[PDB]
Design a protein around this ligand. Structure first.
Ligand SMILES: *C(=O)CCCCCCC
Ligand SMILES: *C(=O)CCCCCCC
Lengths: 300, 300
């Protein structure tokens, strides 16, 4: 038992981190097979990336893997990411995929500086397409990932910090999550919402862990609960969310719409001093999959 | 900016994790040089000396992935079994075995069948238990800290107590607290909030621009400790004040000045406000955790 903000083990990603330098700019790169991926702003107010890239040559990119220098034999741009072909395939390349995640999904971040790891943490892609990360200057090129049975699915690459302290980035194909751009223009995160299906998943995790003070004898309907969710800035609950919660409702014997009646009471009345898994706020950064994995040992 | 529950990168520890089987029990072992360390209760199903004397090297099946490591010797040190193997771990990091004090945090690499599954951060509570997240089969999973390239192993998982919290040993097999590896009725004593860690996290909040809770008054250790006792917080000592010195210098806020701000939070509550997104005071970030995360300390 117990329930924590658990990230995936980072070792498979640590073996892929390199330092990429172009002129006075230094950031991180991800080295998979014979290619190094990094934010294209490593070569750059009003940039003409295509003209900047044609002006640069292979020798203008300094790639360092620990103490070894990688010879760059090619270079191309894919959206907001720069791909540097190197003369050696990474002997530590794990099984990997590049995936674009949807809002509400969680992933681990290996924060890096100068191609070296600082730490790992778990975060979620918010409904407004930002992440509440922990990044400082030089963390660009740090990636977010999920691990499924030895295969690393890379989903995020860090590019920037927005005015409110939240972060923006791209998938490993260079496509920004949300409306953000890699230019020094005005851009801010939109209004965010709470991920309802994750709050319910975490309520089931609390029940599995013995916290049942918030349970009640009542059951609501999807339509009635969604009216409550809109008032509290919670994402609408769909029948697909109810279905995905299936293993947790089966394990605890509590229907999803029975748990929704507990959530409605918690939204309207609070906790009156009590806590749920050590928290006085409703937590929305654990998916239903994260909960079955951590609480029941699914995939372990 | 941002402040997350951040674990150390786990790559150096994943390279040491192996599967240890004795009869019908499978658990995790830590492989350093030509020795595998694991909980001695792997030999059970209770006189441990007699259970070990009856065992032979062939009764221990050790696997590093799908590769078997032949056991060529065995011995018991306190509550850990040391299995000498025919292969030295070529991924053995620079390491130390350290026994930590209550309040200290560490990263746990949760493992099942010798396979790393998750990483999270937790603390040695003042009652010598850890509020971890472990399931059946997680025994032999370790807790650690890293400094430069040296891994200090501080915890090996052995058991879960009635309240869902956990108990284990250092890597020399000595239990933290008054717990034993027997099937007896053991219980965690009353816990206390780690004051020095709460102060550290308030400095983390200040570094991140959260400063509504600051006041310009100062207090004394004696006056602060009267309030601490009332709210089940550990007394603050001159050692804790000295340990907060660097964070005090970084923010320009004296330790006793921050104590007067914590005193007001304890007596008045947060009144609907949050600090680093939390409605409760967090006590599982040490002063050093704040320095590492806010300055971007990396590991080699
Ligand atoms: C990047 O520097 C993070 C802060 C952005 C603020 C922009 C001006 C309001
Ligand atoms: C180990 O078996 C964890 C559960 C212990 C509870 C004993 C009964 C209170």
């Amino acid at each position: 038992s117990g329930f924590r903000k658990m990230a995936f083990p980072s070792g498979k990603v640590e073996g892929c981190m390199v330092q990429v330098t172009c002129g006075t700019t230094t950031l991180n790169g991800l080295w998979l097979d014979d290619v190094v991926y990094c934010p294209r702003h490593v070569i750059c107010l009003n940039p003409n990336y295509e003209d900047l890239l044609i002006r640069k040559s292979n020798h203008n990119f300094l790639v360092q893997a620990g103490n070894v220098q990688l010879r760059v034999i090619g270079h191309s741009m894919q959206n907001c990411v720069l791909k540097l072909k190197v003369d050696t395939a990474n002997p530590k390349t794990p099984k990997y995929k590049f995936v674009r995640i949807q809002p509400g999904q969680t992933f681990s971040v290996l924060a890096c500086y100068n191609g070296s790891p600082s730490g790992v943490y778990q975060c979620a892609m918010r409904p407004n397409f930002t992440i509440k990360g922990s990044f400082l200057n030089g963390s660009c090129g740090s990636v977010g990932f999920n691990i499924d049975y030895d295969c690393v699915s890379f989903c995020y690459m860090h590019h920037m910090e927005l005015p409110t302290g939240v972060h923006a980035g791209t998938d490993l194909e260079g496509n920004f999550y949300g409306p953000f751009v890699d230019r020094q223009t005005a851009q801010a995160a939109g209004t965010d919402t709470t991920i309802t299906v994750n709050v319910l998943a975490w309520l089931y995790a609390a029940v599995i862990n013995g916290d049942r003070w918030f349970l009640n004898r009542f059951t609501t309907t999807l339509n009635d609960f969604n009216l409550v969710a809109m008032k509290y800035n919670y994402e609408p609950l769909t029948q697909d969310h109810v279905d995905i919660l299936g293993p947790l409702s089966a394990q605890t014997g509590i229907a999803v719409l029975d748990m929704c009646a507990s959530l409605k009471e918690l939204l309207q009345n609070g906790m009156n001093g009590r806590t749920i898994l050590g928290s006085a706020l409703l937590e929305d950064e654990f998916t239903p999959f994260d909960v079955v994995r951590q609480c029941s040992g699914v995939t372990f």
